[PDB]
Subunit: 170 residues, 3 copies
């Protein structure tokens, strides 16, 4: 009846997820590259000058930790929620392709996607501050900050639909 209507919505949200996943990978790789190449800390004048300013803008956002001379560590926690969200998608998508296993494995996937949703919400609230900060948009390109943003907003929304449809099936 509508249980056939539901499997469709679950099929959509997995495309929505996988679509979202690529957009976050885009924005994250953009910022990581931009962080990997930074003119600021090269000369020691721009170290004593820009190390406090770098630390205080990334700390001001209360999620991302500041790693001024460690660009690989800067986004380490943002790279994590992407890895985690893919691990969930590996499950939630395999729930869709072989729906027979939803009986057994659905409580597992929800327990993980419940946790994943919190890290995205924490990120969005934190990265929204990055877009409202001019110095942030200056050093890290404002479109790279925005690409990662909408990527996560898609993830959270795709998780919401993944929660509804996979939550109620059969």
């Amino acid at each position: 009846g509508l249980n056939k209507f539901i499997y469709v919505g679950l099929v959509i949200s997995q495309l929505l997820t996988l679509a979202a996943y690529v957009v976050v990978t885009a924005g994250a790789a953009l910022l990581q590259k931009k962080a990997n190449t930074l003119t600021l800390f090269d000369t020691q004048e721009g170290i004593d000058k820009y190390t406090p300013v770098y630390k205080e803008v990334f700390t001001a956002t209360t999620y991302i930790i500041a790693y001024p001379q460690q660009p690989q560590y800067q986004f380490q926690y943002q790279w994590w929620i992407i890895q985690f969200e893919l691990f969930v998608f590996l499950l939630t998508a395999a729930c869709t392709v072989f729906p027979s296993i939803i009986k057994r494995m659905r409580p597992v996937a929800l327990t993980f996607i419940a946790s994943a949703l919190v890290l995205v919400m924490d990120n969005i609230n934190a990265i929204f501050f990055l877009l409202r900060n001019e110095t942030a948009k200056a050093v890290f390109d404002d479109y790279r900050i925005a690409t990662a943003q909408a990527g996560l907003i898609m993830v959270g929304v795709a998780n919401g639909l993944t929660i509804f449809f996979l939550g109620s099936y059969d």
Copy 2:
């Protein structure tokens, strides 16, 4: 036998969730009314002296991001869980009003309420420091902070009960 007990514990927990929404929104609006009236940044004089404390006080908590001259974004993440709790309350309540759909719908609510709960727990640790910080209590008065805090404690336990009752049911 055990079920009619759990349904009452579920209906009771659903009502205590409702009373928790008031006290939260009360102190949340009380703090917001305080954030909109701040005369610190009225005088350009006070703009320079009070801003370093205003940022430090809020950023000393690892949750609430400091928006000194943007009072609308100050509590933005507090209002989020309020709306998110409201959305999750819509899910959990319709479960208890039409218990037949607890079968199909239940894991949707448990997934969100999980994500919703940690957002509640992360908030209380923050507000606690604000209750333990004198500068914050002078600007935003204590009863406003404590009211928002008292409410946050109430939706926390109410969500905890809903997980125990709605969680284990027929």
Copy 3:
């Protein structure tokens, strides 16, 4: 069939959860020992001097709030996730020792362990900065922080294994 394999994974994960629980509490007791006794603030020289950088290092992490002169509250949010992990242990061990109670009580334990898993993650990404930050390792010795970070990894994994087997059981 494969069901008894899942149960073997559950028993080992439940014992890995208990085994992990000790290592974190040790690393937490080490830090609280070092926090409850430190002479930085013994004299008014160290109070005015080291308090700004004390509040700088903890707030440099995006998680742990800085309480320089009140060591009782210093690690407060870290002791919290330790009790929440134990409360879930009562739930998931009751499920694992008495599998009868699983069907009704598993969503209760799953919803709670879903929220517990994100607090362990948020802690890890934070205390990692402590390990990567030189000034923080001189006050609280590096072995104490690693002892704490050890148990936090072991706790998060055993939660992931528990969620897998306890979620997929029967």
